[PDB]
Amino acid sequence: ALKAEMDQLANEIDEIGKTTAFGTTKLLAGGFSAGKNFQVGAQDGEDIKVTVKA
Amino acid sequence: ANTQANVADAKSRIVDVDFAKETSQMTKNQVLQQTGSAMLAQANQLPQVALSLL
C-alpha cells in the first residue's frame, strides 16, 4: 500500500515535468538547459540569459 | 491553479492597456487638436494681403 502511493506521487512528478508550458513551448523538459537570450536593451549584445534544466 | 494565475499574468502583460500612459497620450493629442485648429483658421486668411495691395 505504501509503495502504491509512492508510485502515484512519482507519476505526478513526471507529469508536472512534461506538462508545464508557456502557451505551447515546454519549460521543464530540457529546452532551456542551454539558456535562451532576451535582448533587454536598445543595442546588440545587451541581453540576459534564462536557464532551466529538466 | 498556480499555473493559471501565472499564465494570466503573462497574457495581461501583452494584451491589456496601461491607463497611466494612455490618458497622457489622450491629453497631449487634445491640446494639439486645439492648436492645429487655431493655426489652420489663421492660415486660411493669408490671401487677403492682395486686397490691401489692390
From TrEMBL, chain A:
Organism encoding this protein: Shewanella oneidensis (strain ATCC 700550 / JCM 31522 / CIP 106686 / LMG 19005 / NCIMB 14063 / MR-1)
Lineage: Bacteria, Pseudomonadati, Pseudomonadota, Gammaproteobacteria, Alteromonadales
Entry function: Flagellin is the subunit protein which polymerizes to form the filaments of bacterial flagella. FlaB is not essential for flagellar synthesis and motility.
Similarity remark: Belongs to the bacterial flagellin family.
Gene name per UniProt: fliC
Entry's localization field: Secreted; Bacterial flagellum
Record's protein name: Flagellin
Entire protein: shown range: 111 to 164 of 272
